[PDB]
């Protein structure tokens, strides 16, 4: 997260860290057994770390759970980073408490101009912002017109742009797979962008509201 602020600890209780000996991507707890992330973050096995604030300090709030299953969207395309969404089944259910709470799936697609929250432990590009401490950022959803104007012909139905065309504030590498929360629902998944916080290159996010049938179907009947 570039140009952000340190989240109030545990204010994003759904936020998880994907760990393979080190933090490499974010994700969102959706219920006790499943985590939503980005398909481009795929690894056959990962450790999910819940209840984190400072990922390099033991706080007493953490839960470290290994994955039992990692499911990439069936139409994920790495060429164009289309359908950049994945499901992670926890080997054991998470414990819901004051530190760990699921985030709701969206019951509608949020329109352009909606202010959202993005968070993560990715690069901050700043000497005073510690990427070790969960970072928060307020970002508005951009129109499809602005999004495609910025990345001509690269924006599919499965994506939406959010951020600032002026640059300066953005999600970045290491934030990938993390949440975009709007009005208390999970609207997006950190997915891609050209650089981080560069003028004219806003962040691109997987559009969660078009995947609700696949998500619930996968979580329920398997
Ligand atoms: Ca910690």
Contact 100, 51 (CB under 8 A): yes
**Catalytic residue selected from 14, 40, 53, 73:** 40
**Residues 169 and 188 both lie in one domain:** yes
Determine the distance separating the centroid of ligand 1 and the alpha carbon of 151, expressed in angstroms: 37
**Residues 37 and 124 both lie in one domain:** no
**Residues 171 and 201 both lie in one domain:** yes
Smallest Cα–Cα separation from 94: which of 52, 33, 51? 33
The C-alpha angle 90, 44, 84, rounded to 5 degrees, equals 85
Report the C-alpha gap between 158 and 18 in whole angstroms.
23
| C-alpha to C-alpha distances, 113 to 161, 184, 191, nearest whole angstrom | 11, 16, 19
**Residues 83 and 124 both lie in one domain:** no
User: Which residues sit in the known binding site for Ca(2+)?
Assistant: 52, 54, 57, 62
Experimental approach:
X-ray
Q: DSSP per residue over 98-114, as a string?
A: SS----BPPSSPPPTT-
**Residues 77 and 115 both lie in one domain:** no
CA dihedral 159, 8, 31, 131 (to 10 degrees): 60
**Catalytic residue selected from 28, 131, 176, 191:** 176
**Residues 136 and 91 both lie in one domain:** no
Instruction: Provide the resolution (angstroms).
Output: 1.8
Determine the distance separating the centroid of ligand 1 and the alpha carbon of 134, expressed in angstroms: 10
How many domains does the chain fold into? 2
Contact 43, 30 (CB under 8 A): no
Report the C-alpha gap between 182 and 159 in whole angstroms.
15
To the query of whether residue 40 is one of the catalytic residues in this protein, the response is yes
| CATH code for position 125 | 2.40.10.10
**Residues 112 and 177 both lie in one domain:** yes
Smallest Cα–Cα separation from 50: which of 88, 120, 103, 101? 101
Pairing of strands 5-6, 15-19: unpaired
Determine the distance separating the centroid of ligand 1 and the alpha carbon of 207, expressed in angstroms: 29
Range of the domain at 84: 13-102+210-222
Report the C-alpha gap between 222 and 150 in whole angstroms.
38
**Residues 28 and 51 both lie in one domain:** yes
Write out the two tokens for 65: 């759970």
């Amino acid at each position: 997260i570039v140009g952000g602020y340190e989240c109030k600890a545990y204010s994003q209780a759904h936020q998880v860290s994907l760990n393979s000996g080190y933090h490499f991507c974010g994700g969102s707890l959706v219920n006790e057994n499943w985590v939503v992330s980005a398909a481009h973050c795929y690894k056959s096995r990962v450790e999910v770390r819940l209840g984190e604030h400072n990922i390099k300090v033991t706080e007493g709030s953490e839960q470290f759970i290994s994955s039992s299953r990692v499911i990439r969207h069936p139409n994920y395309s790495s060429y164009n980073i289309d359908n950049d969404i994945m499901l992670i089944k926890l080997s054991k259910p998470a414990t819901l408490n004051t530190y760990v709470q699921p985030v709701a799936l969206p019951t509608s697609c949020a329109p352009a101009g909606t202010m959202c929250t993005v968070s993560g432990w990715g690069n901050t590009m700043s000497s005073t912002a510690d990427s070790d401490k969960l970072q928060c950022l307020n970002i508005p959803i951009l129109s499809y017109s602005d999004c495609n104007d910025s990345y001509p012909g690269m924006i599919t139905n499965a994506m939406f742009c959010a951020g600032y065309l002026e640059g300066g504030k953005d999600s970045c590498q290491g934030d990938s797979g993390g949440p975009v929360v709007c009005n208390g629902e999970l609207q997006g998944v950190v997915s891609w962008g050209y650089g981080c916080a560069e003028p004219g290159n806003p962040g691109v996010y997987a559009k969660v509201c078009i995947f609700s049938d696949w998500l619930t179907s996968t979580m329920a009947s398997y």
